[PDB]
Design a protein around this motif. Sequence first.
Motif, short mmCIF file in Angstrom:
data_model
loop_
_atom_site.label_atom_id
_atom_site.label_comp_id
_atom_site.label_asym_id
_atom_site.label_seq_id
_atom_site.Cartn_x
_atom_site.Cartn_y
_atom_site.Cartn_z
N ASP A 6 31.47 93.37 51.97
CA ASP A 6 32.89 93.06 52.11
C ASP A 6 33.18 91.65 51.63
OD1 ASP A 6 35.25 94.43 52.88
OD2 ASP A 6 35.46 93.08 54.61
N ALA A 7 34.46 91.27 51.65
CA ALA A 7 34.87 89.94 51.22
C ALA A 7 35.41 89.13 52.39
CB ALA A 7 35.93 90.05 50.12
N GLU A 8 34.73 88.02 52.69
CA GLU A 8 35.14 87.16 53.79
C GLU A 8 36.39 86.37 53.43
OE1 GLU A 8 32.93 82.81 53.27
N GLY A 9 36.70 86.31 52.14
CA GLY A 9 37.87 85.59 51.68
C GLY A 9 37.72 85.08 50.26
N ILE A 10 36.48 85.02 49.78
CA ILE A 10 36.21 84.54 48.43
C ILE A 10 36.24 85.69 47.43
CG2 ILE A 10 34.81 82.86 47.19
CD1 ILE A 10 35.59 82.12 50.07
N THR A 11 36.33 85.35 46.15
CA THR A 11 36.37 86.35 45.09
C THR A 11 34.98 86.58 44.50
OG1 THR A 11 38.58 85.50 44.51
CG2 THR A 11 37.57 87.09 43.00
N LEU A 12 34.07 85.65 44.76
CA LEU A 12 32.70 85.75 44.25
C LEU A 12 32.10 87.11 44.60
CD1 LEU A 12 31.89 82.29 45.72
CD2 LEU A 12 31.81 82.69 43.25
N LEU A 13 30.95 87.40 44.00
CA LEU A 13 30.27 88.67 44.24
C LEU A 13 29.63 88.69 45.62
CD1 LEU A 13 28.36 91.06 44.15
CD2 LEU A 13 26.98 89.83 42.47
N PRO A 23 38.10 89.16 59.65
CA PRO A 23 39.23 88.22 59.68
C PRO A 23 40.04 88.33 60.96
CG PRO A 23 39.74 90.08 58.27
CD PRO A 23 38.30 90.24 58.67
N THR A 24 40.39 89.55 61.34
CA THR A 24 41.17 89.79 62.55
C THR A 24 40.43 89.30 63.79
OG1 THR A 24 40.29 92.05 62.82
CG2 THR A 24 42.32 91.80 61.54
N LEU A 25 39.11 89.20 63.67
CA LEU A 25 38.28 88.74 64.78
C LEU A 25 38.38 89.70 65.97
CD1 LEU A 25 38.63 85.33 63.71
CD2 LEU A 25 37.33 85.33 65.84
#
Length: 33
Positions: A6-13, A23-25
């Motif tokens: 998944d993506a924590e917030g970055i666009t990287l691979l 995110p919602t925690l």
Amino acid sequence: GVLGNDAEGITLLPLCFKPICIPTLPPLTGGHA
């Protein structure tokens, strides 16, 4: 943004997993004890 799928917030691979990093925690019900 460290390792997973998944993506924590970055666009990287290489991103953090979905569950491992949400995110919602989690809720605030198990913070009593």
